[PDB]
């Protein structure tokens, strides 16, 4: 438990706070509001769980059944089913899961900061850091349709390397002025991906 | 009971008559003397019974052979069960019964139409009402043989369908060859010919046309033009109004024609020049030869290398599948599998259209199909029976959800599937395979289909040998756009393509934009329901226009249908998201609602009648009324329902009031059956199958459905609503996935198929869907009852209405006093007021259990009902001076604040009780006592309307010396009196309640002090374990209550009339939580609390409790062994939290006991207060350090202090002259025996000894420390009759003499005596001394535990009992052992010691019976039948032998239980294990509550040294010249210095043993 | 042995060894799962002859009084209470429990009552067996004369 509490105070240093930012016609705004609310709820739950487990590891607090299970699985090193709300690849370890959650929290903090001040369209986003990327893409499509008064059925995608999506990574290919080229490299990073609805 | 059996089987009839007469004589001779010995004394009774059994077996085998011969005579009679077929045999002359079994023998032939004299059948009739006239009628007169005339019916039906198909093809040739088609001729043709015939005729005409065109570019264009012309004619014909049968025929035919148009377009897009191209060979092909004289094989259905013959079986109308290209690919691979003689096996996620696609393929080929919902209850004999039924008929099996089939059984049935596949492969080239050790004919039309979902609910996978026999096919994404377009064009819509292209991506965005929910479904099933609702509302709007062709608002119609289907499914947050999606998809959207004035007014009337708050849409009840209307719409348009929401959202009242309003409107009575699925086992819910004989009993739901189907009491006319008031999990809800689907039937393992009539709607009342699967979410309609739908002010208004009407003791003074109370608490309940603010603050606070609104609200309502009862009692007490208005006001206005305090904060700690009191004092202007320090919770409202403190109520009592630690005596304190008043308040109303708190907090003591105040209630104590089943409650009811038949049903009443029987459950939350978040006992108790009773599983009859109430005790759910309860149960049951008394209460609680017991010594009485003050902080420090985290048995409670005081009192009762040092020695010895035997390591034992020394020194200065405290500190009564201290050496000599005597009588096994064995034997003797003393010894085997127990029991005159465990030791033999032990204990009145080991336990029933025996002292449900009467006779004989004369049964049983408590001592031996200790803590609370724990452990180093030095002292081991080494390896402490040779070698032996450990 | 021994022989050599050792005294070979096991045990206790029981994995607790060596002294007569029958325990009664699986754990109640004899395979024994097999399959005359010479040397040491 001494080393467990050492690691327990080690992990949550990158998790401090998140705002919740509530009735607008903008699909992007309402989607970002509900996503940052979900992220804030998850962050508060994780912080409360960490505070409770620190208190029971070193402090005046007895261990309940839930806290006993939590401390057992944290010593074991596997992610709890309670924290796993979004998609995690094949049970990633907690060491990288906390970094992934921290990255998501910082991204949502930047989203809330930008929305606190449209200016929401000018931001740049990374698609892997959101909870529901298909909801993000459909919200972008809905925003484009609402702006241009077009038909959702025949709305295609033109992709250039007017929405900025970052963090996309290729698999055995290279991009030069939007021309794919085969390569022996395992993966390549796309700098910035432009999405236009035509 | 049939006279035809006598005629058909005369020899068997005579044999049965002889057997019956012989058995009549035998049973008359038996009944003339019912004694077992007298029956055995009959001459030749065994031989007569053997001969009768042989004769019965012979006649049974003969009748079975004859019945199987009849089955072989008619192949379709293999479906009919034995009793129904016997009824058919006995009803051959009369044919009024035979019309009720055609559903199981034919796909759609519901009934057949006969002549008026029934001498000839003329044709068949469909389920819908369509008819097919036979070409030549079948007369049963010239063919009286049932098989002969039924085969004539079959072949006549075949040739009739063939002739009709040929005529239809000759007719449709004209329409195919005509450029323009006259609608009148087309419609009269369609009316002339059946649905399947006209569809197949269109197929044949299209295939012949395309073949001729390809034989002759331009001809293909001509064929496509002809198809488009026919399609335009169809659209023109279907746009107008038509009879429903013709409308369905046109819909099916237009779907088929649009599929044919798509196929021809695909063919003409490429360049096809020959008929051998695969692009043409891969589609459906039909061929008709007029030259074939065999009309059965006239039609050939062909695909790519797959030639087939049409089934020619009537199917009715059914539903036509939309020919998706995915469906075409599925058809291709299924027909390839069928040609390869391998059964097909589509698989994929639920809702992709697997079983419906297989059904449509089977209907396309004309084959009879049978959809089976296989589950874990399928047995091998049942599966073989349905396999042989398929094989001897030709019906296609369509086993749905094949993966949940008990994988060992899956492997077992793989062999049968292999035999069937091999038989078919041989058939493809008198063809017979063997099934269930019997050769059975195989029809050529066989097919087995498997519909399985991978990874649905963790179901079992498939073995590879079985996977090899099935051709897999994955279907994941059906063409939603194409199916929507085709079905909308079929139903008739001008902009069908636009509507589909707008509604399918609408669902695509709807499945992704909204929040994730466990009960959200947007699959193909939801899309199809939306489209069908759109068609229905379009027809309704067309009728609404036409009552007064043109155009209709198709977009508005579709939006209205999608709203009426989807908006009840949503949560309150997602409705604006859905509305925005509809706005952007359809700009000119609009909406329409209302137009429900009649139902709305009837709902208002019944809401007013039933004391409910009505809303019109924007008032207080608007959301709830809107939800009721949504439920009505979903009931009308859908099949299966569920009301999803948190506990207490008005779903039950919603569906009840809707049922009553619907009954008021339509005039049809609404019968509703409420079933809890988890309160009983799934076996009891659905039905049982005997492995011995293949006989099927009905479960609860199956019996209800069978009764509805039979409709002997006109059940079909009335509206039937079956509700499953429980929680859903895929173990039992997957048995209804065929019921809730469009198949509309229930399948059973024995093969009996129960269709579902349209009158029945199957609904659910669930809390969450987080444990059910998508396969069962996707089938029902969701109505989401949110938490804020039901409002606290509506609850208050209902409570006030129920107070003003419906008096408590059911004009009357109760009515007037209730009305006065309602009028004076009216300003408090309404709007915000007081109670809502207090409730919001209570929700802000935390509690021991989860706090819901309705728990504390029901608490409040019961407390106020008790206040009204108190006012009524005072009014009766003062007839000259009734209750004045201002006094009633100033009394109820304070009872209200007291009641909300003890309701909202009744399950919290003292600090938060004070916090809520301070909050209420700050927030309300109500007269309150003036005390800045005393909380409001420390006050009692008086009948005079003033606050009376409890501190004035509690008296300073001094209990007598005779009872100091008796089980019933309680000294009154603040907490005890407050909880006493609260418990009396609860129990006056016969309401459930749960005492939650830490173990040993006095909760059952408080409850029993409450029950002893009211003489009208008697307690039946129950104890729960981990493996607790509602059978325990059932047997408690069986023993303590009786079942009585009444005109309004059956009722359960206590045997003692005029009394209320209360059930006390000490471990209510301890029953285990299963894999799906439920407890069967908890759900059972909740069901009987809500609905007033349960379902008697003997005959599935609803039973009603007459005078039964429940009281509960439990540990907090945070404890290691306990689990939290469900909200749906915690709603009705208030929870009161009792904590440990603490020092400031325990001081006087045990000061009164010590001052009561320090009376026999008139000189010691000045030490009572320092003695109690000394015993306080020892208990406090033991609580401080030895927490439950270290060990599961480290629980310290005031039960230990009570045992302490009782031990001191038993020690010094005869001693009568004790100095201070002797008293301190007794105190220290009791402290050691209570706080050191449970410890494990020696360090904590040393800590306890140091604590005892420092406590005695601190609290008792200037005393003889050496005299009071010593090393051995032993106490015994063997040497002298008084309980005096003994010396170790004198005790050892006496014990050695006792062993030397003891080896002679019982066991000649020598023993070695040392200090630890002396301590153990004294401990066991002391625990055996007190009555109801039960042991628990933990230690490694071989430490002498059972031998020492045997020695103690021999010394104290206790008969040692060993259970004599052997092989195949089962439950009945264990119960025989227990009943013999209990008989010898309670009837013979002898001292008995029960010795049994952990290894002697083989089943959890053993541990459960030991649990209840240890705790209650009796085992209910153990003595039944004449064995019970023998026990009662033994008990009355024992009473007569003792001297006391008793009577009746219950007091004799109570005396027997008291004798068992006094006599039976039970000893347990365990082994130390980390898992085992907490496992037994979870599975047996009595083993760690009613049993004192002794931790022998392994032998210590000192014990090993002493036994070695004692044993090796008999031989020469001294070396006169021995050199002590300077290293001196020391493993045993306190070695003598300098050690000798024998000391060194004994130390070496100890070292050897320790090094073996490491 | 003092406690009745349990032998763990996965090779089958120890069973034949104990049969050849106690050949003059009759041994009834039986197993725990056999139906006539209790009757065999009763016959062994009455007759006072050695008994060997195999397959102790399915151990039944009916042998607990015998393994614990509990005894009732009826004067000079030796009495044991086995189940529900009182049997005169002859002093010349010995029981052996066999095993074919070394990878079996036992409960401590069975572990305390018996003496464990583990018949494993070691380097010297394996090398000697393989060398003797190689000599048998390669140099038959040398192998047989070596066997004769060792037997002669052993009985000559007996003569010494
Ligand atoms: N429209 C209403 N107006 C007033 N009171 C109501 C209304 N609907 C429900 N109630 C109250 O709700 C209380 C709780 O019972 P109800 O049957 O409504 O619960 P429920 O939502 O079915 O609960 P559960 O989910 O736990 O089964 C009832 O005592 C009733 O008085
Ligand atoms: N291609 C289709 N054409 C018409 N109806 C379909 C189609 N696919 C699915 N359905 C509908 O979906 C349901 C089929 O259920 P299905 O998905 O086969 O059950 P399971 O999920 O067990 O495979 C039926 O109500 C059927 O009407
Ligand atoms: N106020 C009190 N006055 C006297 N005895 C008390 C008091 N509180 C607790 N006790 C003692 O504590 C014990 C409580 O045990 P019990 O109520 O049986 O525990 P549980 O309720 O967990 O079964 C009783 O034996 C009782 O003598
Ligand atoms: N103090 C002792 N002196 C001598 N032998 C002992 C002693 N304690 C136990 N034994 C031996 O242990 C055997 C049984 O041990 P015991 O612990 O009583 O049974 P179990 O191990 O099944 O609980 C007896 O045969 C006895 O010879
Ligand atoms: Mg299915
Ligand atoms: Mg309800």
Contacts of B1365 in chain C (CB under 8 A): 61
Q: Is the CB of B1307 under 6 A from ligand 4?
A: no
Main-chain dihedrals φ then ψ at residue B474, nearest 5 degrees: -105, 125
Tokens of B1332: 């109801």
> Which run of H or E residues covers position B354?
none
Contact B501 A153 (CB under 8 A): yes
CA atoms within 13 A on the CB side of B1293: 5
Dihedral Cα B713, B718, B719, B724, nearest 10 deg: -20
Judged by a CB distance cut-off of 8 A, whether residue A127 touches chain B is no
Distance between alpha carbon A127 and the CA centroid of its chain, in Å? Answer: 8
**What string of H, E and C letters represents the secondary structure of B1408-1464?**
HHHHHHHHHCCCCCCCCHHHHHHHHHHHHHHHHHHCCCCCCCHHHHHHHHHHHHHHE
Contact B1341 C112 (CB under 8 A): yes
Nearest residue in A to B587, CA atom: A149
Round to whole Å and give the CA distance between B319 and B742.
10
Cβ neighbourhood burial of A86 (10 Å; 0-12, 13-18, 19+): middle
Round to whole Å and give the CA distance between B1187 and B1208.
26
Q: Residue B866: which of B948, B982, B1018 has the closest Cα? A: B982
Q: For residue B432, what are the β-bridge partners? A: B441
- How many cross-chain Cβ pairs, B to C, lie less than 8 Å apart? 36
The separation between the first and the last C-alpha atoms of chain A, rounded to the nearest angstrom, is: 58
CA atoms within 13 A on the CB side of B819: 7
The DSSP-derived string for B841-891 is HHHHS--SS---HHHHHHHHHHHHHHHHHHHHHHHHH-SSS---HHHHHHH
Are B286 and B204 contacting, i.e. CB atoms less than 8 angstroms apart? yes
Identify from B505, B849, B1475 which residue to disrupt to test chain A contact, counting A C-beta atoms within 10 A and taking the largest count.
B505
Main-chain dihedrals φ then ψ at residue B672, nearest 5 degrees: -125, 130
Cβ neighbourhood burial of B94 (10 Å; 0-12, 13-18, 19+): exposed
Q: How far is CA B104 from CA B134, B435, B524, B757, C134, in A?
A: 21, 22, 30, 15, 76
Q: How many residues does chain B have?
A: 1558
Q: Residue B562: which of B578, B544, B540 has the closest Cα? A: B578
> Which run of H or E residues covers position B300?
strand B299-303
Are C113 and C68 contacting, i.e. CB atoms less than 8 angstroms apart? yes
Tokens of B1388: 């013979």
Contact C70 B1400 (CB under 8 A): no
Residue C104 three-state SS = coil
Helices B910-923 + B885-904 axis angle, to 10: 140
Q: How far is CA B16 from CA B58, B66, B68, B894, in A?
A: 10, 15, 20, 81
In the block, tokens 């604006």 appear at B576
Q: Residue B1063: which of B1047, B1081, B1048, B1079 has the closest Cα? A: B1081
Nearest residue in C to B1368, CA atom: C60
Q: Is the CB of B324 under 6 A from ligand 3?
A: no
Helices B45-73 + B10-31 axis angle, to 10: 150
In the block, tokens 């009281």 appear at B1111
Distance between alpha carbon C102 and the CA centroid of its chain, in Å? Answer: 16
Q: Strand B1359-1362 to strand B1392-1397: parallel, antiparallel, or no bridges (unpaired)?
A: parallel
Task: Spell out the long-range contacts of B87-91 with Cβ–Cβ below 8 A and sequence spacing 24 or more.
Answer: B87/B2, B89/B2, B89/B4, B89/B5, B89/B8, B90/B1, B90/B2, B90/B3, B90/B4, B90/B5, B91/B2, B91/B4
Contact B513 A142 (CB under 8 A): yes
Question: Which residues, 6+ apart, have CB-to-CB distance to C138 below 8 Å?
Answer: none
Round to whole Å and give the CA distance between B532 and B322.
14
Round to whole Å and give the CA distance between B338 and B346.
13
Contact A142 B502 (CB under 8 A): no
Å from B1289 to nearest chain C CA?
29
Q: Residue A122: which of A157, A160, A163, A161 has the closest Cα? A: A163
Neighbours of B1461 (CB within 10 A): 15
Our mutation pick for probing the ligand 4 site, out of B1335, B1344, B1470, B1496, counting the most ligand atoms within 8 A of Cβ, is B1344
Round to whole Å and give the CA distance between A68 and A74.
10
Our mutation pick for probing the ligand 1 site, out of B608, B653, B865, counting the most ligand atoms within 8 A of Cβ, is B653
Round to whole Å and give the CA distance between B1146 and B613.
50
**Rg for chain B, CA atoms, rounded:** 42
Tokens of B972: 């009154």
Round to whole Å and give the CA distance between A43 and A65.
22
Dihedral Cα B249, B250, B256, B261, nearest 10 deg: 170
Round to whole Å and give the CA distance between B813 and B802.
16
Q: Is the CB of B1434 under 6 A from ligand 1?
A: no
Q: Which residue's alpha carbon is nearest to atom 27 within ligand 2? A: B356
In the block, tokens 């619907």 appear at B662
Are B957 and B1152 contacting, i.e. CB atoms less than 8 angstroms apart? yes
Distance between alpha carbon B126 and the CA centroid of its chain, in Å? Answer: 41
In the block, tokens 């939800």 appear at B627
Round to whole Å and give the CA distance between B923 and B840.
13
Q: How many residues does chain C have?
A: 160
Cβ neighbourhood burial of B27 (10 Å; 0-12, 13-18, 19+): exposed
Question: Which residues, 6+ apart, have CB-to-CB distance to B1316 below 8 Å?
Answer: B1499, B1500, B1502, B1503
Are A120 and A36 contacting, i.e. CB atoms less than 8 angstroms apart? no
Are B136 and B148 contacting, i.e. CB atoms less than 8 angstroms apart? no
Phi-psi region of A59 (alpha: psi -120 to 50; beta: other; left: phi over 0): left
Round to whole Å and give the CA distance between B1022 and B1420.
10
Are B731 and B456 contacting, i.e. CB atoms less than 8 angstroms apart? no
Instruction: Tell me the helices (H) and strands (E) count for chain B, helix number first.
Output: 57, 40
| In B191-237, beta strands by DSSP E | none
In the block, tokens 């049970």 appear at A91
Q: Residue B630: which of B643, B613, B645, B620 has the closest Cα? A: B643
From ligand 4's centre to the CA of B1498, what distance in Å?
Answer: 12
Q: How far is CA C27 from CA B808, C61, C94, in A?
A: 84, 22, 10
Q: Is the CB of B1343 under 6 A from ligand 4?
A: yes
Q: Is the CB of B707 under 6 A from ligand 3?
A: no
Round to whole Å and give the CA distance between B413 and B382.
11
Are B199 and B252 contacting, i.e. CB atoms less than 8 angstroms apart? yes
Round to whole Å and give the CA distance between A144 and A138.
10
Phi-psi region of B1254 (alpha: psi -120 to 50; beta: other; left: phi over 0): alpha
Nearest residue in C to B1364, CA atom: C83
Q: Residue B1363: which of B1344, B1349, B1379, B1340 has the closest Cα? A: B1379
Are B384 and B434 contacting, i.e. CB atoms less than 8 angstroms apart? no
Residue B937 three-state SS = helix
Ligand 5 ion: residues within 5 Å (CB): B 355, 400, 451
Q: Is B48 annotated as a binding residue?
A: no
Contacts of B516 in chain A (CB under 8 A): 132
Q: Cis omega before residue B1538 (within 30°)?
A: yes
Round to whole Å and give the CA distance between C63 and C61.
5
In the block, tokens 């296609």 appear at B396
Neighbours of B1447 (CB within 10 A): 8
> Which run of H or E residues covers position A159?
strand A157-160
Q: Residue B813: which of B865, B871, B861, B866 has the closest Cα? A: B871
Q: Strand A163-166 to strand A193-197: parallel, antiparallel, or no bridges (unpaired)?
A: antiparallel
Identify from C32, C38, C109 which residue to disrupt to test chain B contact, counting B C-beta atoms within 10 A and taking the largest count.
C109
Round to whole Å and give the CA distance between B1328 and B1332.
8
Cβ neighbourhood burial of B1227 (10 Å; 0-12, 13-18, 19+): buried
CA atoms within 13 A on the CB side of A31: 22
Question: Which residues, 6+ apart, have CB-to-CB distance to B751 below 8 Å?
Answer: B79, B382, B385, B386, B389
Are B875 and B817 contacting, i.e. CB atoms less than 8 angstroms apart? yes
> Which run of H or E residues covers position B658?
helix B651-666
Round to whole Å and give the CA distance between B958 and B240.
97
Question: Which residues, 6+ apart, have CB-to-CB distance to B640 below 8 Å?
Answer: B736, B739, B740, B761, B762, B763, B764, B779, B780, B781
Round to whole Å and give the CA distance between B1015 and B995.
21
The dihedral sign for the CA sequence B275, B281, B286, B291: positive
Q: Residue B765: which of B618, B592, B844, B648 has the closest Cα? A: B648
Our mutation pick for probing the ligand 3 site, out of B994, B1179, B1196, B1198, counting the most ligand atoms within 8 A of Cβ, is B1198
Neighbours of B1315 (CB within 10 A): 16
Contact A145 B502 (CB under 8 A): no
From ligand 1's centre to the CA of B791, what distance in Å?
Answer: 10
Are C56 and C99 contacting, i.e. CB atoms less than 8 angstroms apart? yes
Q: How far is CA B923 from CA B824, B839, B841, B946, B1498, in A?
A: 19, 13, 11, 20, 63
Tokens of B776: 């069962």
Q: How far is CA B371 from CA B357, B738, B747, C123, in A?
A: 12, 8, 8, 66
Contacts of C61 in chain B (CB under 8 A): 1365-1366, 1399-1400
Q: Residue B1128: which of B1177, B1091, B1164 has the closest Cα? A: B1091
Are B279 and B334 contacting, i.e. CB atoms less than 8 angstroms apart? no
Round to whole Å and give the CA distance between B1082 and B1131.
12
DSSP B908: S
> Which run of H or E residues covers position B306?
strand B306-309
Are B59 and B15 contacting, i.e. CB atoms less than 8 angstroms apart? yes
Instruction: Beginning with the edge strand found earlier in the chain, give each strand of the sheet holding B1337-1338 in spatial order.
Output: B1359-1362, B1392-1397, B1464-1469, B1337-1338, B1494-1495
Round to whole Å and give the CA distance between B1278 and B1089.
55
Round to whole Å and give the CA distance between B639 and B632.
12
Q: Is the CB of B1345 under 6 A from ligand 4?
A: yes
Q: How far is CA B170 from CA B165, B175, B215, B257, B314, in A?
A: 9, 10, 21, 18, 20
Deposited experimental method:
cryo-EM
Are B791 and B782 contacting, i.e. CB atoms less than 8 angstroms apart? no
Q: Residue B1232: which of B1154, B1329, B1326, B1347 has the closest Cα? A: B1326
Are B366 and B302 contacting, i.e. CB atoms less than 8 angstroms apart? no
């Amino acid at each position: 438990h001494t080393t467990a509490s050492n690691w327990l105070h080690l992990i949550p240093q990158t998790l401090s706070h998140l705002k919740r930012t509530e009735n607008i016609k903008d699909p992007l705004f309402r989607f970002f509001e509900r996503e940052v609310k979900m992220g804030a709820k998850l962050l508060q739950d994780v912080r409360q769980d960490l505070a409770d487990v620190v208190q029971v590891c070193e402090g005046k607090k007895k261990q309940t059944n839930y806290l006993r299970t939590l401390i057992n699985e944290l010593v074991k090193g596997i992610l709890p089913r309670s924290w796993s709300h979004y998609t995690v690849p094949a049970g990633m370890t907690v060491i990288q899961w906390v970094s992934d959650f921290s990255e998501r929290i910082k991204q949502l903090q930047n989203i809330s900061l930008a929305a606190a001040s449209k200016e929401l369209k000018n931001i740049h986003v990374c698609l892997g850091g959101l909870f529901v990327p298909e909801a993000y893409i459909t919200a972008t499509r809905q925003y484009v349709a609402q702006a241009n008064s077009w038909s959702l059925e025949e709305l295609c995608l033109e992709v250039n390397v007017s929405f900025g999506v970052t963090g996309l990574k290729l698999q055995g290919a290279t991009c030069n002025n939007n021309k794919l080229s085969l390569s022996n490299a395992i993966s390549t990073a796309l700098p910035l991906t432009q999405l236009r609805w035509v | 009971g049939s006279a035809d059996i006598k005629h058909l089987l005369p020899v068997e009839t005579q044999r049965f008559q002889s057997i019956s007469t012989e058995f009549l004589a035998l049973m008359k001779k038996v009944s003339k003397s019912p004694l077992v010995m007298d029956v055995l004394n009959i001459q030749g009774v065994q031989r007569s019974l053997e001969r009768l059994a042989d004769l019965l077996g012979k006649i049974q085998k003969a009748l079975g052979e004859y019945l199987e011969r009849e089955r072989s005579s008619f192949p379709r009679f293999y479906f009919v069960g034995d009793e129904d077929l016997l009824e058919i045999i006995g009803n051959s002359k009369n044919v009024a019964k035979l019309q009720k079994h055609f559903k199981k023998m034919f796909a759609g032939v519901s009934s057949i139409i006969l002549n008026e004299d029934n001498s000839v059948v003329l044709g068949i009739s469909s389920r819908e009402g369509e008819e097919v006239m036979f070409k030549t009628p079948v007369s049963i007169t010239e063919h009286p043989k049932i098989n002969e005339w039924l085969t004539l019916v079959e072949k006549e039906m075949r040739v009739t369908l063939a002739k009709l198909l040929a005529e239809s093809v000759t007719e449709v040739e004209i329409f195919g060859k005509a450029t323009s088609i006259d609608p009148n001729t087309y419609i009269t043709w369609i009316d002339k010919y059946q649905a399947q015939l006209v569809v197949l005729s269109a197929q044949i005409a299209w295939s012949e046309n395309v073949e001729t065109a390809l034989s002759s570019a331009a001809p293909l264009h001509s064929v496509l033009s002809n198809v488009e012309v026919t399609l335009n004619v169809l659209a023109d014909s279907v746009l107008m109004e038509q009879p429903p049968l013709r409308r369905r025929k046109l819909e099916h035919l237009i779907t088929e024609l649009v599929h044919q148009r798509d196929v021809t377009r695909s063919l003409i897009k490429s360049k096809i020049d020959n008929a051998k191209s695969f692009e043409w060979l891969s589609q459906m092909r039909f061929y008709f030869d007029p030259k074939q004289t065999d009309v059965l094989q006239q039609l050939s259905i062909q695909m790519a290398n797959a030639k087939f013959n049409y089934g020619f079986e009537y199917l009715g109308v059914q539903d036509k599948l939309v020919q998706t290209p995915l469906t075409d690919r599925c058809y291709l691979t299924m027909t390839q599998a069928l040609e390869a003689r391998l059964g097909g096996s589509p698989f994929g996620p639920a809702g992709t259209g697997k079983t419906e696609s297989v059904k449509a393929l089977g209907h396309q080929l004309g084959r009879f199909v049978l959809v089976f919902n296989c589950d874990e209850t399928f047995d091998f004999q049942a599966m073989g029976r349905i396999f042989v039924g398929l094989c001897q008929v030709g019906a296609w099996g369509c086993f749905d959800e094949f993966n949940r089939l008990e994988e060992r059984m899956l492997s077992a049935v793989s062999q049968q599937v292999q035999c069937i596949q091999e038989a078919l492969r041989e058939h493809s080239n008198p063809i017979t395979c063997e099934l269930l050790n019997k050769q059975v004919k195989v029809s050529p039309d066989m097919a087995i289909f498997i519909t399985m979902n991978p990874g649905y609910a963790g179901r079992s996978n498939l073995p590879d040998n079985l996977k090899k026999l099935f051709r897999s096919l994955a279907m994941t994404k059906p063409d939603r756009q194409l199916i929507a377009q085709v079905m909308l064009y079929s139903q008739g819509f001008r902009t069908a393509e636009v509507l589909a292209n707008k509604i399918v991506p609408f669902f695509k965005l709807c499945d992704e934009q909204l929040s994730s929910q466990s009960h959200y479904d947007f699959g193909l099933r939801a899309l199809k329901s939306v489209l069908v609702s759109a068609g229905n509302v379009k027809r309704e709007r067309i009728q609404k226009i036409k009552r007064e062709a043109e155009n209709l608002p198709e977009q508005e119609i579709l939006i209205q249908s999608v709203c009426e289907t989807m908006v009840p499914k949503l949560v309150a947050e997602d409705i604006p998201l859905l509305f925005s999606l509809l706005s952007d998809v359809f700009p000119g959207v609009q909406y329409h609602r209302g137009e429900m004035t009649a139902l709305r007014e009837e709902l208002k009337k019944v809401c007013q009648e039933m004391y409910l708050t009505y809303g019109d849409g924007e008032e207080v009840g608007g959301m709830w009324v809107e939800k009721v209307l949504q439920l009505y719409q979903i009931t009308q348009i859908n099949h299966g329902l569920m009301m999803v929401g948190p506990s207490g959202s008005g779903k039950s009242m919603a569906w009840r009031v809707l049922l009553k309003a619907l009954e008021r409107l339509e005039g049809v009575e609404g019968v509703a059956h409420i079933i809890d699925p988890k309160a009983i086992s799934k076996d009891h819910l659905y039905g049982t199958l005997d492995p011995n004989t293949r006989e099927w009993t009905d479960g609860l739901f199956t019996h209800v459905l069978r009764k509805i189907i039979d409709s002997v009491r006109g059940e079909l006319q009335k509206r039937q609503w079956i509700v499953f008031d429980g929680d859903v999990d895929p173990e039992w809800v997957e048995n209804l996935n065929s019921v809730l689907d469009d198949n509309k039937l229930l399948t059973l393992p024995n093969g009996e198929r129960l269709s579902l009539p349209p009158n029945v709607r199957i609904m659910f009342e669930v809390q969450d869907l987080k444990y059910a699967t998508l396969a069962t979410v996707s089938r029902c309609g969701m109505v989401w009852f949110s938490e804020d739908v039901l409002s606290t002010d509506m609850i208050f208004n209902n409570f006030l209405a129920r107070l003003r009407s419906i008096p408590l003791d059911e004009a009357s003074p109760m009515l007037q006093i209730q009305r006065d109370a309602a009028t004076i608490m009216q300003p408090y309940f309404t709007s915000n007021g007081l109670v809502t603010k207090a409730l919001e603050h209570a929700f802000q606070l935390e509690h021991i259990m989860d706090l819901t609104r309705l728990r504390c609200l029901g608490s409040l309502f019961s407390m106020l009902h008790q206040a009204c009862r108190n006012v009524a009692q005072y009014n009766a007490n003062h007839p000259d001076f009734p209750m004045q208005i201002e006094q009633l006001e100033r009394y109820i206005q304070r009872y209200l604040v007291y009641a909300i305090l003890w309701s909202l904060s009744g399950d919290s700690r003292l600090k938060m009780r004070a916090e809520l009191g301070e909050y209420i004092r700050r927030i309300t202007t109500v007269p309150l006592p003036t005390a800045p320090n005393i909380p409001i919770i420390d006050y009692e409202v008086s009948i005079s309307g003033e606050w009376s403190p409890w501190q004035a109520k509690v008296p300073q009592i001094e209990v007598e010396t005779h009872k100091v630690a008796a089980p019933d005596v309680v000294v009154p304190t603040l907490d005890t009196v407050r909880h006493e008043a609260l418990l009396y308040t609860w129990l006056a109303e016969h309401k459930p309640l749960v005492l939650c708190g830490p173990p040993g907090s006095g909760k059952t003591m408080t409850l029993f002090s409450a029950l002893r105040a009211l003489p009208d209630m008697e307690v039946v104590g129950l104890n729960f374990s981990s493996a607790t089943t509602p059978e325990l409650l059932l047997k408690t009811f069986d023993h303590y209550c009786e079942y009585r038949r009444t005109p309004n049903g059956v009722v359960l009443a206590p045997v003692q009339l005029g009394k209320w029987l209360v059930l006390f459950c000490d471990e209510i939350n301890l029953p285990d939580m299963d894999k799906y978040g439920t407890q069967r006992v908890i759900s059972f108790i909740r069901q009987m609390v809500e609905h007033g009773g349960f379902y008697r599983t003997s005959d599935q009859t609803w039973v009603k409790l007459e005078r039964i109430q429940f009281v509960g005790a439990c540990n907090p759910p945070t404890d290691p062994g306990r689990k939290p309860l469900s909200h749906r149960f915690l709603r009705h049951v208030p929870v009161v939290y009792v904590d440990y008394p603490g020092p400031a209460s325990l001081t006087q609680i045990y000061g009164t006991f010590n001052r009561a017991m320090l009376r026999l010594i008139p000189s010691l009485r000045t030490y009572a207060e320092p003695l109690t003050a000394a015993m306080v902080e020892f208990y406090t420090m033991s609580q401080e350090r030895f927490t439950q985290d270290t060990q599961p048995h480290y629980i310290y409670s005031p039960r230990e202090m009570t045992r302490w005081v009782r031990g001191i009192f038993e020690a010094l009762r005869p001693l009568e002259t004790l100095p201070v040092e002797g008293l301190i020695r007794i105190w220290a010895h009791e402290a050691l025996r209570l706080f050191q035997d449970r410890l494990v390591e020696d360090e904590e034992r040393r800590w306890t000894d140091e604590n005892i020394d420092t406590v005695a020194l601190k609290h008792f200065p200037n005393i003889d420390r050496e005299k009071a405290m010593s090393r051995p500190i032993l106490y015994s009564n063997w040497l002298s009759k008084d309980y005096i201290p003994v010396d170790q050496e004198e005790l050892r000599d006496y014990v050695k003499a006792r062993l030397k005597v003891f080896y002679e009588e019982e066991l000649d096994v020598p023993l070695v005596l040392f200090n630890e064995v002396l301590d153990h034997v004294l401990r066991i003797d002391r625990i055996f001394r007190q009555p109801q003393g039960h042991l628990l010894l933990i230690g490694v085997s071989g430490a002498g535990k059972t031998t020492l127990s045997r020695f103690v029991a021999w010394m104290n005159g206790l008969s040692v009992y060993q259970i004599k465990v052997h092989r195949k030791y089962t439950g009945e033999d264990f119960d025989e052992d227990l009943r013999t032990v209990l008989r010898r204990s309670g009837c013979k009145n002898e001292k008995i010691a029960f010795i049994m080991d952990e290894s002697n336990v083989l089943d959890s029933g053993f541990l459960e019976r030991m649990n209840t025996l240890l705790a209650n002292g009796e085992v209910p449900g153990l003595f039944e039948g004449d064995e019970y009467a023998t026990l009662m006779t033994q008990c009355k004989e024992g009473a007569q032998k003792e001297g006391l004369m008793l009577d009746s049964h219950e007091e004799l049983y109570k005396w027997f239980t008291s004798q068992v408590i006094r006599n039976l001592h039970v000893v347990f031996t365990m082994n130390p294990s980390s898992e085992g200790l907490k496992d037994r803590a979870a599975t047996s609370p009595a083993l760690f509550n009613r049993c004192v724990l002794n931790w022998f452990g392994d032998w210590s180093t000192e014990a090993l040294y002493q036994v070695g030095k004692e044993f090796t002292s008999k031989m020469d081991l001294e070396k006169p010249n021995y050199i002590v080494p300077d290293y001196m390896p020391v493993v045993y402490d306190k070695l003598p210095q300098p050690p000798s040779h024998r000391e060194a070698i004994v130390n070496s032996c100890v070292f050897v043993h320790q090094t073996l450990h490491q | 042995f003092n406690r009745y021994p349990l032998i763990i022989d996965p090779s089958g050599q120890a069973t034949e060894f104990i049969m050849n050792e106690y050949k003059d005294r009759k041994i009834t070979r039986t197993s725990f799962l056999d139906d006539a096991f209790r009757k065999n045990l009763e016959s062994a206790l009455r007759f006072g002859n050695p008994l060997l029981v195999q397959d102790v994995e399915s151990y039944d607790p009916v042998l607990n009084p015998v393994l614990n060596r509990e005894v009732r002294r009826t004067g000079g007569r030796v009495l044991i209470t086995l189940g529900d029958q009182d049997i005169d325990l002859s002093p010349s009664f010995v029981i052996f429990l066999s095993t074919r699986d070394p990878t079996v754990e036992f409960p401590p109640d069975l572990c305390s009552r018996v003496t464990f004899v583990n018949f494993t395979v070691t380097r010297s024994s394996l090398q000697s067996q393989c060398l003797n097999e190689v000599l048998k399959a390669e140099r038959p005359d040398v192998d047989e004369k070596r066997s004769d010479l060792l037997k002669l040397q052993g009985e000559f040491q007996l003569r010494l």
